[PDB]
Paper text:
Ctf18-RFC belongs to the RFC family of AAA+ ATPase clamp loaders, which are involved in the loading and unloading of clamps onto dsDNA. Compared to other clamp loaders, Ctf18-RFC contains two additional subunits, Ctf8 and Dcc1, which bind to the C-terminus of Ctf18 to form the Ctf18-1-8 module. It has been shown that the Ctf18-1-8 module binds the N-terminal catalytic domain of Pol2 (30,31), the largest subunit of the leading strand Pol ϵ, and that this interaction increases the clamp loader activity of Ctf18-RFC.
Previously, we showed that the yeast Ctf18-1-8 module forms a relatively transient complex with a truncated construct of the Pol ϵ catalytic domain, Pol2(1–528), through the WH3 domain of Dcc1 (Dcc1WH3) and exonuclease domain of Pol2 (Pol2EXO). The crystal structures provide an extreme example of this. Here, Dcc1WH3 has slid by 16 Å along the negatively charged Pol2EXO surface and forms entirely different molecular interactions with it. Although this conformation is presumably influenced by crystal contacts, approximately the same interface is utilized in two different crystal forms, suggesting it is a readily accessible state in the conformational continuum. Thus, our data show that the complex uses flexible electrostatic interfaces with low specificity that are readily adaptable to maintain tight complex formation in different conformational states.
Author numbering:
A (entry chain C): 2 to 132
B (entry chain D): 718 to 741
C (entry chain B): 2 to 121, 143 to 171, 178 to 241, 249 to 307, 311 to 380
D (entry chain A): 29 to 59, 77 to 91, 109 to 175, 190 to 214, 237 to 524
The structure:
């Protein structure tokens, strides 16, 4: 089998939106990379009921329970990542020599669609520190 | 909620791709 | 700052593909969509390529040890409210993003080359270029090179070349502009259709084999090809002196259309004051042993007669003279730089 | 009797044959870019024969070809006198005293910037006759001046000819072309050999064998292999550590040591190098190659015209021997701690070459021949591009001002170089 790459939507959205200013792509997309395993709760639904207004850790978006797991602060090339309430990681925004294309493989119709392009990444290679 | 830090970074050797690698 | 959110389940349909500048420009081309294509042979074994109208790239998957999470910007259905106890290092949150996928590998693209799959009913040519690790242009070029139509055998393809030349010359068909319809009507003019295997597809096949597209005439290709067939018919058994076999070979000819001879045409398909036919695909594929057997065949070789006999063998891609000095040793003279080995 | 005359003429004629075999026939213009020069002795061609001293100059032409041409010149030295009023009496004495060696003599009172001789041997016999008289004076005979001008140097100075400049060879002599300054491009070969050795000892050419020779010719790499030792055929590969340093290597898998040697000499004859470069080849490479050559009954001088000179160094007439180690020690300004090939490569070419413990070189020949061959060719790449980027412009430009061939300007003490420059200016 074989199938074409659909890039019509990505082209229309790129042409219709302004030039890239920060690390965030013009399509409103970013890449976070962490040298490690992101340990998240295995049951979002149970903890969303236990969520207190002070924590603000869970919310509902389009029928999916999203967890607010951290904050990102970009200071030029330097970057700092807050995870949970108790973790701070130091890293950098680095340009990938070979850009990466996000391709959605729709198994239903065996169709592939271009979603977005990486356009830099925020990587964290140093040991997390206390807040 | 936390991040389990990997002490360093490794990228494995490039590998060939079969049809099943893309459509799993 | 930016609030960070994660979905409890990520879609594995999203996959990262590496972007070369040329592909980056082909994709960022708003004048023609659907210019790239993920081609491959089967559904469980063969590799995957991405082809344009004239190029080819192979895919290579590389896994990494980092957490790579794709994020998108959304509009909160309800305002995101939380106490920020930390007072230093965090600005007021103005945007919200959610992780929708988690890629643990990347997909690289590196330019490559293609071949055809002649396993098997396929029916059409788009289905053959479909299940074949190759691009579009290379596929049609090789399909024209192998005389496919199914695939015509050598005897039938060359009896069809002979009958085609006879019919084209008999009706005085214009050499500059030819089409399939005129030639097909010239072939099956005074013969019945039940005994006429030369349909229009066969005519187009013979054209694409001995010409390129009207189909422009490739005179050297056809004449030299016919000469190679004469070599396969006469000196495939016995060797003969150069002069007498030049006479007996030149004696064989197609119909009316003339053919000029040259030292270049009489090169690359025979070996020597003698001459006997030789084929390239039958020599040992090892370079050192190939040059050994070639040196064992002729005590002395010619530059023009061996230069096309060694260009396809070694796949280093280095210079021709380097190739020559490499697995052998030169010994030039006045007329032409010939070669011998001890 | 002067039976040694005829032997120096025989050596001269063998050198003439070597020169003609490699494409430097003697051109005589009717009644080129200079790359080397050597003193020689020639018979009449333009009842006692002994030959005429002169100097051969080696030229590359504008059409990719080459030739040699010869200048004849009377060797000469002087005799000073402490009493000018009686110089004429000295003349009469020496005219007689030196009848057996002297070609001519000239009196000069005051000039600006003389005993001439038929050849260098006669000059040296004159010096041998004059030395006891000067030693005793601790007959009025003042001592000779402080300087000893080499005959080839004497000709280069007096005729005002320098390697690296362009000349038209004419019956009147060599005419410098001041319009052409850009150098021509010699054929340049650089090579490094790899040899066996015993564990924990040094290579000894009496019993150890050469296992590989790597070299480069005008930017193309070659590696010749001795399959009595290297346990598989090595295949063609590329080693290019910087774009500045391309390296495509061609392999010659030879059956044994003699075949490797014969491919090397024959290939050299094929390409006709006029520079051959090494790294410490005067003390290692060359004597080892010479000794294996002798072991197989080959005569290296007859094969490619190289032989050891009075210093034990390996020299030819037509091709300079550029031992990069000599330049490293004299001119690089590097500390002795950084005079190894590795440190020179890092300092001067700006990259980190392949490294292999010498004790591992013999076993890997059998067990891991590709790694050993990568080390060997890395050596050859470093040596070639070290020569081309640093040694060639410097040495040849120095030749354009110093009246010496490349070998000597590379090898003479800096004190002697200064001496030669000062001698030229005077």
């Amino acid at each position: 089998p074989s199938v074409d790459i659909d890039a019509s939507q990505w082209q229309k959205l790129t042409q219709s939106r302004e030039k890239q200013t920060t690390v965030i792509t013009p399509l409103g997309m970013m890449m976070l990379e962490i040298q490690g395993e992101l340990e998240l709760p295995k049951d979002f639904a149970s903890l969303a009921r236990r969520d207190s207004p002070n924590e603000g850790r869970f919310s509902e978006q389009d029928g999916e329970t999203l967890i607010r797991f951290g904050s990102l602060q970009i200071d030029g090339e330097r970057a700092t990542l807050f995870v949970g309430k108790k973790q701070r990681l130091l890293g950098k925004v680095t340009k990938l020599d070979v850009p990466m294309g996000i391709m959605h493989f729709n198994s239903k119709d065996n169709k592939v669609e271009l979603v977005d392009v990486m356009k830099y990444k925020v990587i964290f290679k140093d040991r997390p520190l206390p807040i | 909620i936390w991040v389990k830090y990997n002490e360093g970074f490794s990228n494995a050797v490039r590998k060939n791709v079969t049809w099943n690698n893309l459509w799993e | 700052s930016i609030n960070l959110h994660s979905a409890p389940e990520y879609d594995p349909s999203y996959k990262l593909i590496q972007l070369t500048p040329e592909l980056l420009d082909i994709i960022q081309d708003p004048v023609q969509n659907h210019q790239l294509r993920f081609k491959s042979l089967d559904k469980d074994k063969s590799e995957v390529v991405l082809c344009s109208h004239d190029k080819t790239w192979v895919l290579k998957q590389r896994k990494h040890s980092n957490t790579v999470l794709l994020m998108r910007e959304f509009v909160p259905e309800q305002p995101i409210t939380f106490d920020e106890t930390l007072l230093f290092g965090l600005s007021k949150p103005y945007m919200d993003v959610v992780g929708f996928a988690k890629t643990e590998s990347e997909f690289e693209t590196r330019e490559t080359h293609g071949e055809l799959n002649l396993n098997s009913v396929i029916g059409t040519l788009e289905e053959l270029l479909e299940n074949s690790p190759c691009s579009a242009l290379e596929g049609i070029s090789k399909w024209h090179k192998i005389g496919g139509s199914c695939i015509l055998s050598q005897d039938f393809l060359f009896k069809a070349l002979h009958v085609l030349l006879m019919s084209a010359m008999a009706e005085s068909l214009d050499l500059q502009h030819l089409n399939v319809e005129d030639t097909h009507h010239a072939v099956g003019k005074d013969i019945e259709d039940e005994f006429n295997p030369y349909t229009r597809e066969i005519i187009e096949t013979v054209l694409n084999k001995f010409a390129v597209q009207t189909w422009r005439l490739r005179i050297p290709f056809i004449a030299q090809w016919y000469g190679i067939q004469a070599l396969r018919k006469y000196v495939s058994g016995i060797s003969m002196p150069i002069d007498e076999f030049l006479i007996k070979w030149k004696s064989l000819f197609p119909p009316f259309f003339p053919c000029d001879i040259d030292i270049d045409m009489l090169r690359g398909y025979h070996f020597k004051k003698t001459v006997q036919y030789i084929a390239k695909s039958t020599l040992p594929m090892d370079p050192k042993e190939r040059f050994k057997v070639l040196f064992r065949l002729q005590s002395q070789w010619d530059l023009e007669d061996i230069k096309p006999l060694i260009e396809e063998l070694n796949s280093r891609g280095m210079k021709i003279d380097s190739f020559i000095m490499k697995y052998a040793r030169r010994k030039r003279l006045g007329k032409k730089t010939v070669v011998t080995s001890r | 009797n002067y039976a040694l005359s005829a032997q120096q003429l025989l050596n001269a004629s063998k050198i003439d044959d070597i020169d003609s075999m490699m494409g430097f026939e003697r051109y005589v213009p009717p009644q080129g870019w200079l790359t080397n020069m050597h003193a020689t002795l020639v018979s009449q061609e333009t009842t006692t024969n002994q030959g005429i001293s002169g100097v051969d100059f080696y030229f590359l032409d504008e059409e990719g070809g080459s030739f040699k041409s010869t200048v004849v010149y009377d060797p000469y030295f002087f005799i000073a006198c402490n009493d000018e009023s009686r110089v004429n009496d000295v003349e009469e004495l020496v005219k007689k005293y030196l009848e057996s060696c002297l070609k001519s003599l000239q009196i000069i009172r005051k000039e600006d910037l003389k005993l001439s001789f038929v050849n260098s041997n006669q000059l040296f016999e004159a010096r041998k006759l004059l030395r006891p008289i000067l030693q005793d004076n601790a007959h009025l005979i003042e001592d000779i001046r402080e300087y000893d001008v080499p005959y080839h140097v004497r000709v280069s100075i007096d005729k005002d000819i320098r390697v690296g400049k362009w000349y038209k060879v004419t019956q009147q002599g060599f005419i410098e072309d001041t319009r052409k300054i850009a150098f021509a491009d010699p054929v340049v070969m650089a090579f490094a050999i790899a040899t066996t050795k015993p564990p924990l000892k040094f290579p000894d050419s009496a019993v150890d064998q050469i296992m590989m020779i790597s070299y480069m010719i005008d930017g193309e790499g070659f590696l010749i292999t001795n399959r009595e030792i290297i346990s598989e055929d090595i295949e063609d590969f590329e080693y290019t550590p910087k774009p500045e340093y391309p390296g495509f290597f061609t392999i010659f898998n030879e059956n044994d040591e003699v075949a490797l040697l014969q491919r090397f000499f024959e290939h050299i004859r094929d390409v006709r190098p006029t520079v051959i470069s090494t790294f410490n080849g005067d003390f290692f490479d060359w004597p080892f190659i010479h000794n294996r050559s002798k072991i197989h009954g080959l005569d290296m001088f007859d094969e490619i015209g190289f032989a050891p000179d009075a210093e034990g160094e390996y020299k030819s007439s037509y091709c300079s021997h550029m031992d990069c180690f000599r330049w490293v020690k004299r001119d690089s300004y590097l500390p002795q701690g950084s005079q190894g090939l590795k440190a020179v490569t890092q300092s001067k070419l700006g990259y980190n070459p392949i490294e292999l413990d010498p004790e591992l070189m013999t076993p890997y020949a059998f067990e891991k021949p590709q790694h050993l061959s990568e080390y060997s060719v890395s050596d050859a790449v470093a040596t070639y591009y070290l020569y081309m980027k640093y040694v060639h412009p410097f040495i040849f430009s120095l030749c354009t001002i110093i009246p010496l061939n490349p070998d000597e300007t590379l090898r003479k003490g800096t004190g002697t170089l200064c001496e030669m420059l000062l001698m030229v200016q005077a």
